[model samples]
Target: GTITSQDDNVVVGYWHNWCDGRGYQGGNAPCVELKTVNPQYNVVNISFMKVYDIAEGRIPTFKLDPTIALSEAEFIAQIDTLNSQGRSVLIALGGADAHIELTRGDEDALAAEIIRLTDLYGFDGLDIDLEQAAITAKDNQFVIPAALKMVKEHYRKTGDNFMITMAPEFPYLTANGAYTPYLTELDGYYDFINPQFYNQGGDGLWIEGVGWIAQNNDALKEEFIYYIADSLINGTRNYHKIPHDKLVFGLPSNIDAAATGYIQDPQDLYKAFDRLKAQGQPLRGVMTWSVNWDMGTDAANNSYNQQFIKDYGNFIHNQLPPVTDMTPTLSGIVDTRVELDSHFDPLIGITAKDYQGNDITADVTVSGSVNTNQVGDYLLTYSVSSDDETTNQPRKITVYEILPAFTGITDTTVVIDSEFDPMQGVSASHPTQGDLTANITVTGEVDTNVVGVYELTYQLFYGQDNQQNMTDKRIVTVVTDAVSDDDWQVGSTYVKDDKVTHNGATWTAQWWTKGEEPGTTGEWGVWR
Candidate 1:
């Protein structure tokens, strides 16, 4: 939504319309209505917006669970009532028990019904919960993200910030990202994502530094939840990054909520939030699987839910703001890299705090220059202040090409008798795929012994298939000698009285100059 700052401390909850809560243990899990979902949940998602019959021309649709006493009009009115109190009601598509199918050319039809449902029921946005074959179906992967993009653009044209979010099993949200192609394919088009931490047995977080953080142990459960949430807050070494406000923690309501990944004690949940909060994550807040299970008739689950909510509402939900009386320690701003033409928000993962160790990240302001379209170094300055003092820091962002490019040894000249190795100082790399030289192939030899120009071609090929057809060419000339002394070379320093030729013109450095192009130095600048 064009990088709008989300409301801090948001409680994102999913309200399932199905009776006998689909996620509940022994059915009879009670029903929750649109208007009565706990107020603590500011952002509500109505679950199971589906495609009832794909064979009849794929169209997104929803049904009011029969157990619900409210009629169609009454349901819409309840959504309106909820919206009046500033709660967002989104139509969630697919679920664990649901199936979704979209073949080629089905984008507009799917978006049409989505917008129709949104307009008819006043849904603020869309939530994707497609799992299993519904998600992994080759066409489904690209179609879903594309359809949602159309949905978002429809709302955007009307000056509305239509929220688009996603829910996936943790395994699907991993670095491989093979299970849910939409996650990376969408490219931050969605508002937030709440990946389910439950259901997957013994498969917790695979953090590089922390190994496997188990969610079963109560003692380390908070750490488990912390790493689970924190790992994705700013992205791991290989994961796609999302804003802290967009990576809401998705967990079940109680032990009965899912087979695993529930914090028996809500305090552990609070502790996780506390750690993330202390580090200044403007965390969007937690998400419960189904509101019914949290408020269901199970005496044990209900009691735990109440006690959990009570403790959370008093502390985590209403946590106090960091005091700003002391000097701020604006930190964790590190030099990073971004792929060319990719999205990068400089302020997402920054940390700021006061001398008393109070988080003041919200107080920070960013002022600097960066261009995602360009490959260069950009310095972004981050500043946070208090009544008595202010702290400022700088972080560099190195933007690189996503398409593979040779780092060194481009077209150049070699001395007539000097031994020349075509691979000397030559390497290929891509921002996403890292080094390509290991599998990169080179053809067309460079004849440095002959007084003629020769070209070398390099392309990435693992076996029979050419990977992305990432081919690059380099030229080598066996010349009499290199450029004259008056010719300027990049990365060379020039002192006073030093002369150099640049762009077919001679210029002298007024003082000591290094890497400064001649014309850009101005009339009386470094070079003239």
Candidate 2:
């Protein structure tokens, strides 16, 4: 009956509303029932609360999905039981699709609404899971962060430490460090940030402005965390460096959680933690995308949640020794041809480590020829010698001829009887022919009087034998102008039930109007 910091290695899991009592996939397998939740998790995030409207300038209207887990009373009772066990249950706002945001003017109303929801639901805290626009550009930087701080301080007045956590994608916190302003403004008032580290796929390299560390699969998992740790601990672009204890690595609990980036074996995840611990990085425990996907009848059978509890439930350690002889690793090695005059980095993923397993990637020497101006194969050699042992690897970069291309023309539709120019934004060019617009030949015609679809073809030629000919097509339509009846003149007064022809269609007046258009549907309400 004591709170231990060592036992504070959190096992947080997201409880998706739609997953309750549903089948996995569309199969015979029954989904996990709400009452059947396991006790392994210390914190359960009930997702999600949707934004009914932000335009309604009062306490925000957010409701749990109606069909989820039966009645709201039953759901609350279930969470009440979990709370009795010293476990925390918070309502998560927004999700991948939900747009929960606060503008600069909505801080007071939004803050009061948050407090109302906290007290109404008896929730321990709020989980901010605003995705896309909510976390990015459309959000009011000062207002949303200020609302969160206001609510946290309001609860603190009661001498209760209200938990305030955030779930953000890796790029939001890493790539540009876009969340730096919010995190800095909130500072100590905020708790942990569970960044979704998975789903980045192989091309997600480049960290702290360094273009290295290819994120492919399990092998690159350690490198992904290392780069993330460096970005948060060392800070980037005037961002406040977060303490390691507040950083929790988030991953897909099951393969269905993401198409790619799901750790196939839970042991591979433990190995990643071991590598970070050995590197002297103080990492908090892990957080999964959803616990519903990990729950089943057989608790011991191939469950990522169960395996995580076994490894770090007591303490964040696996007792695995640090790998001393880390071999030279090479990535971004693609055997493909690049267009002539294009640029690339040959030393993107080449890294090495000393015998003590310390990173000596900068010490590695790279020597090779990568000619982008010529059409040929260039061999690049990567060699590293650490602790008197040398490892070498070679990669090839191919350069190919750049082909002529048409520009500024894609499939488009044009209104009939309109002043339309088919070549308004059309052009052509090539590496050898920078301005090939003069060489372009236009074919086909669009008659303005016609009310039918037409096509305009554009062609350009370059290279020997006239073999390289580029072509493009644009679809156009010529429509008839709207005709108004003489009886429907603007100066004529019209009463309810009066019928008139305007824009080639007959309209019945719903109310009296003089100069208003026959089709106006606003306060005029002229026609039906």
Candidate 3:
């Protein structure tokens, strides 16, 4: 389970389905439908899937909060409604107020009940909010992790994706009997754990250099969440290291949402998170105590959650890359070897498309070289911006000379009543100069009308103005057709009755054996 990342960053909140008329001691929290929770909250955990106080009742249980008056059908529909709006709803188990305990041997029983709920209500995942004293009881930690493993395995068998999360107190993270072990056992399986920063007075970001940035210190508590996540990520405290992306900063939505750990100004936490994101820590997202408390008005009568929504919500989500339903494509790019001095365009037939079938080739920008006039390697960088995400690709180009070749030119005799061409089948090339045959300079030539022995010297040059790099030369002695050549060479044509010596044998052509080798054809064949 190397699932160290979520598909994207998440903004999480816990919902109180069983809220009394007043919330957290006379603060105005109220029970609301899952659909009515703000759309900005992408992940919502329903509070406290519970178990009653009975020795045999180790199996966990759930019920729609009676205060809200929702039938199980209506409750399930609300989940579907929220899911249609791109929000995830999970059942959180064992909050501080719930009566829950897992007997040591009853792990499977609890796991089966969780599976039943996942199938029945279509929950996206589970959230472990076990803040009750029952969790610190003997053997509870080991029992709970085993039960969760059963649940996770069940989901894998069904080929369905699900999430598992936790919201524990700060002490449970740094020092614990079962909580830290639970984290160790289920290290890669869980998405995130938003450790509760509220209700605990003195516990906070404490270490050698910065000392204790206490939860009660409102002036410094903003930095409190920062250092807490840092210690956990760096394993500075308790030696328990979670993936940096899997640790979230737990906070109270308003001042009265918790007994402590609430910032007087919400902007301070926003600024703190902005710095964290820049520094590349706590990448998962932010979470608050309860969604019902977000509607609560502070002492200034400002619904600060709205400010949280405007600044924090938009700031985190909008800055993210655009959501894509489909992957983009790239085409017409190939092994990048460019011919020297030849017309070459790397962008020829290059194409791409984004998620919406948008022809994103126009979005392609190349940053390197197309200079193919030299013998060396050049790297070209291409950046394609599609669906707000940029994909970078690099191609290396090699430039070299094609070398020199002579197809049919040799020292041979030719009978002609007119001018004979000496440049036939002769070619040369270069990375910097292209075709060198055009630069061929003949020092001497034979007049075909008055044929005699004449040396024709040919050389290939580079620079047209004067001289350049490496050059080559070949000499040819043209003779009359009556004269017998010393040897028969390849690519030199001869007529009937022509004689030449090759491989220590003088062979005479019986017929016009054009382009035929003398040794391969002899004695009653084309040559004898």
Global lDDT of each candidate? 0.71, 0.64, 0.69
User: What's the ranking of the predictions by TM-score, best on top?
Assistant: 1, 3, 2
Please give, for residues 1-528, the per-residue lDDT of candidate 1 as tens digits. Answer: 121223445566777677765344553356677777777776778878876665655666898876778888889888888777777888888886565777878887888888888888888888788877777764788788788889878877978877787878776766567643676556446677777777776776666776777656566777787887776765564554455666767777766678787777777877788788788874666677767666665634343344334445445357543222244555567789887768898888787766434668898999887898678999888999875788787899998764566666589988787888777787776655566677667888866667788888877753224435667788888886645547786799889989988886788778887888888876679878
Report the C-alpha lDDT of model 3 over 6-101, residue by residue, as the tens digit.
467777888887764354445566677776778888888887787755564657678777768778998888888877776788889887656665
TM-scores of the models, in the order given:
0.58, 0.53, 0.56
Steric clashes per prediction? 0, 2, 0
In TM-score terms, candidate 2 sits at 0.53
**Per-residue lDDT of 441 in model 2:** 80
Q: What is the C-alpha RMSD of each candidate to the true structure, in Å?
A: 22.4, 21.8, 22.2
Better of 1 and 3 by lDDT: 1
Choose 2 or 3, whichever is better by TM-score: 3
Residue 8 of model 2 has an lDDT of 52
lDDT of 2 by residue, 34-110 (tens): 45666667777877766666565433445666555456777666667777777777767777666555556788877
Worst 10 residues of 3 by lDDT: 321-330
